Every structure is written in C-alpha cells, then in structure tokens.
C-alpha cells in the first residue's frame, strides 16, 4: 500500500536567548523514526524508532553533519525573512518545512512536496508539477525569483523523484515488522444521566494502533451525525490511541442505539449497543 | 537521509 517519507524541519529564533532552536524530524507513514535537536545533550541525529538500530555509525555522523549544515542554513533564513518583511529583530519567529515523497505499491511516485511555513504560515511551496513555485505574499516572490533561478526546482525534484525514494524504500525494508503492525480497538459503551430524563452514552475506542479511525452512532439505521460529540483521537502513552463519540438520547430509547467502530485491525467493523 | 535545503 502507499507509503511515504516526510521530514519536519523547524527553527525558531531566540532574540536574547541564544542561537535559535532547529530540529529535524523524519517520518515513515507518520511514524517518527529519527530526529535531531539543536538543544539536546550534544545535538546529533538520533534513532527514534527502534528498527533504526540497524543503521551504522557512518549513517548518523552523516545525517548529523547534514543537520549541522541545514541548521546554519535556516539560521540565516531567519534574518532573510526579517528583511523581506522589514521586521524588528527583537521578537521571535519560526520556520517549518515539509519535505517528503509518496510512492505506490508499484514503486511509482504518487506525490512530491516541499512546504515552507513562517510563523505558522504558508510562505512558499513546490507545485505538484515538481517544477514551479507558489508564493504567498511579496516576501515569497523575492524568494521565488531567487529560488527558481539557481536551478532549485531541478535539484529538488531529483531528491523527491529519486533520493527520497531510494531511502523510503530502504527504511521500509528494515522496519516493516513494525510500521504496519496491527492493534485492535477495544470498545464498550457507558451510560450517563442528564436532566430532563435524557441521557448521554458515549462510545469508547481504546488500545488501538494505527490512529486513523471513524466511529459512529446510528438512528437504528440513519447517519446519526448532525448532532454529536467527538474528541480528536488521543495518544495513550504506550503507542496506542483512544477516542469516543456520543450524543443525548431519551431514556427507554438507549438500547435502540447502535455504535459502530471502524478500524483496519478489525476483521469486521464493531457494533456496540446499550 | 533528508534533503539539503538552499537559502530563502
């Protein structure tokens, strides 16, 4: 099935509090597996995911220095922006970037991205044609003319179309036993009193990995959606997640309500009823 | 390995 390798880069200026923080965090299927932090014991790319242990020393030192380079790189970027933006050094700002590629079960290349965000905002990004540029404001433009005219798109596309993929594939080969393992949700309902002789019953989904998952309540057949309660899935602590949905119902009607639980680790969706 | 970004 489709997979991907993204890299979340980030650097925040520290006007007064020393050299701004810069971080590099990679992800395979949104699974952090490796990171570098300018503010750790001794900044270095380190293995997050356990299967990374299969890479040797060269690997680390390599990315590590790469990091060190990229670090300085953005450090200046900070200034640059301040310039396009005529900002007062004083306050602090932030830069984040989305680097990654998506491949199919064939090995073909689904999509390639490069997203530049300043102070929680879209600054500039590579189109899907992996050749042009999309700016956001005056600033980005100056950054486009300049960017493009250095052959930027080209070298970028190389990585995406190629490097990115040689690795994404490599990683997978070493961490499949992990990556797409299965953890089944354990559900159950709970009934809660409420004034006016009504009630809320909320459906629980606990102990499940991955995290994507939809859950519903049904009008004994209809899409009981328009009026419910949902909570962004949440990280348990041991790699699993949790989530619940619910709504009010009149007493003596509970049992006439069905909850459904959809999760790729379920041989069949789940049906809860009070 | 991640890319090797170029200035803004």
């Amino acid at each position: 099935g489709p997979h991907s390798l993204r890299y979340f880069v980030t650097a925040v200026s520290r006007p007064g509090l020393g050299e701004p923080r810069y971080m590099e965090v990679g992800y395979v299927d949104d699974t952090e597996f490796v990171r570098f932090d300018s503010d750790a014991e001794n900044p270095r790319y380190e293995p997050r995911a356990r299967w990374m242990e299969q890479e040797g020393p060269e690997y680390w030192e390599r990315e590590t220095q790469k990091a060190k380079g990229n670090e300085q790189s953005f450090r200046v970027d900070l200034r640059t922006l301040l310039g396009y933006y005529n900002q007062s050094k004083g306050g602090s700002h932030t830069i984040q970037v989305i680097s990654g590629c998506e491949v199919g079960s064939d090995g073909r290349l689904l999509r390639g991205y490069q997203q530049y965000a300043y102070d929680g905002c879209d600054y500039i990004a590579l189109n899907e044609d992996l050749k042009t540029w999309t700016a956001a404001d005056m600033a980005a433009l100056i950054t486009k003319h300049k960017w493009e005219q250095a052959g930027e798109a080209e070298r970028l596309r190389a990585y995406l179309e190629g490097t990115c993929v040689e690795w994404l594939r490599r990683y997978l080969k070493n961490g499949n036993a992990t990556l797409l393992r299965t953890d089944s949700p354990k559900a159950h309902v709970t009934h809660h009193s409420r004034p006016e002789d009504k009630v809320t019953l909320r459906c629980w989904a606990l102990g499940f990995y991955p995290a994507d998952i939809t859950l519903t309540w049904q009008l004994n057949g209809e899409e009981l959606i328009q009026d419910m309660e949902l909570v962004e899935t949440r990280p348990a602590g041991d790699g699993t997640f949790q989530k619940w949905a619910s709504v009010v119902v009149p007493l003596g009607k509970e049992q006439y309500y069905t909850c459904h639980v959809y999760h790729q680790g379920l041989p069949e969706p789940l049906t809860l009823r009070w | 390995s991640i890319y090797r970004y170029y200035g803004l």
Epitope: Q65, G69, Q72, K146, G151, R155, A158, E166 | -
Partner: T-cell receptor
Framework: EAAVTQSPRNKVAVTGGKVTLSCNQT?????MYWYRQDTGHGLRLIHY???????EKGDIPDGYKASRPSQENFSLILELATPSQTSVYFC?????????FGAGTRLSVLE | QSVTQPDARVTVSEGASLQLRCKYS??????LFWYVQYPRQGLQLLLK??????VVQGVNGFEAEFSKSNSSFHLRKASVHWSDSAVYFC??????????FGSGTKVIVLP
C-alpha cells in the same frame, strides 16, 4: 553574464603583509567560497558563506579570514602574510550545488 | 566526501576516445561533478550528477556514468579534438555545500 568577479587579479607583497582580495556577484547565489589552487592538491577550500553575516571555516582556514558583508560581496583576509600562502585563489558562488568560479588571483608572498 | 583521480596526466592522439577516471568514498550518494581548467581560465562546468540516471549528458561529447557499484563518475568522450586539451577536475559535494576536488587530470591531445 552568469559569472563571478574576483579582483585584484595579480598581487605580490612581503611577509607580514595584509591584503584584501575581493569579489563581486551578479547572480544572487547565497553561497560563496574561497578555494586555493596549488599543484599537488588541486583546489582546496578555506572559507565559504551562506550569505550576509555568514562565515564558516573550511579545510585550510589558519592564516585566513573570510568576510560576508553583503550577499553580493565576499572577500578573504590575511592579517599576517606568509610565502606559504603564495598561490592562485578563486572565490566561487553556488545556488545549490552548481558552483561558479571566478577569474582567479596571483598572490606571491615574497620575503 | 572524498574524491580521487588516479592519473594526474593523460596523453592521447587527436580524434580518439577519452578516459578520465574518478573514484570516491562516501557512505551515501554524494553529488558528482566535472570541471575543465584551460590556460588562463577559471574552472568551467561540464557535469553534475545529482541522482537518478547514472549516465549524464554534458556539453561537447562529454558524458560520465555514475557507479555506486564501484564508486565512480568517469567523464569519457569519443573523439577528443585539440581545443580540448586541458586539466579536468572531478568533484563531489555531500555534508555541506562546498565542493571537494581531486588532484585533477592533465590530458593532452596530440594533433
């Protein structure tokens, strides 16, 4: 155009000397370098810069001091000279990985 | 980020084929390049092989194939012709932006 200027072109001076071989830029590349061409080793890097205010060491920095005032200009310094330093330099820019070298410079450091 | 040209000086009859051999050591796939140094000139760009296809098509019969198999970016040609006698530099770029050159090769074309 598409190129990098590097002047003075030829320069000679006695030890202890101090010159400032400059370099201009008509190609908005952020990066900039200073290599040292000598027979036996080929080009060797001393100092490069990712833009204004940036100056990061290279492989042979001792005796040299780079300075990145403005995106366009990049220059090398040699407070105290030395005939060991006699050679042909080139500053170079490079918007990514495609470097662009300049004419060059003949500095002979006679005693 | 290392590079190594095994021969410092090559010589071949005009109109013949050319073999400029490079080698390197980098635990990954460093960027590869080929430059030409003429008489009173500055390095000129002939190639760059970022990734993908191991055979690059550069200006004037110059092409080089990359080879992770035996780590090498040899710039070769078919019928080298006089105006092409000069010094060629192989070059890589990994950890950081700057290039890393090899001693280089001095090939000569007997007309």
């Amino acid at each position: 155009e598409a190129a990098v200027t590097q002047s003075p072109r030829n320069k000679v001076a006695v030890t202890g000397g101090k010159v400032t071989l400059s370099c201009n830029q008509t190609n908005n590349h952020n990066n900039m370098y200073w290599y040292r061409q000598d027979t036996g080793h080929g080009l060797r890097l001393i100092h490069y810069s990712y833009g204004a205010g940036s100056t990061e060491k290279g492989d042979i920095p001792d005796g040299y001091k780079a300075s990145r005032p403005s995106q366009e200009n990049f220059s090398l310094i040699l407070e105290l000279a030395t005939p060991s330093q006699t050679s042909v330099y080139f500053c170079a820019s490079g918007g990514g990985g495609t470097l662009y070298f300049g004419a060059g410079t003949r500095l002979s450091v006679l005693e | 980020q290392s590079v190594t040209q095994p021969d410092a000086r090559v010589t071949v009859s005009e109109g013949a084929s050319l073999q400029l051999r490079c080698k390197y050591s980098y635990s990954a796939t460093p960027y590869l390049f080929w430059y030409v140094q003429y008489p009173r000139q500055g390095l000129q760009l002939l190639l760059k092989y970022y990734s993908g296809d191991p055979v690059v098509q550069g200006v004037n019969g110059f092409e080089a194939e990359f080879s992770k198999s035996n780590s090498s970016f040899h710039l070769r040609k078919a019928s080298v012709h006089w105006s092409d006698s000069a010094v060629y530099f192989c070059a890589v770029s990994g950890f950081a932006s700057a290039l890393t050159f090899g001693s280089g090769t001095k090939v000569i074309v007997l007309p």
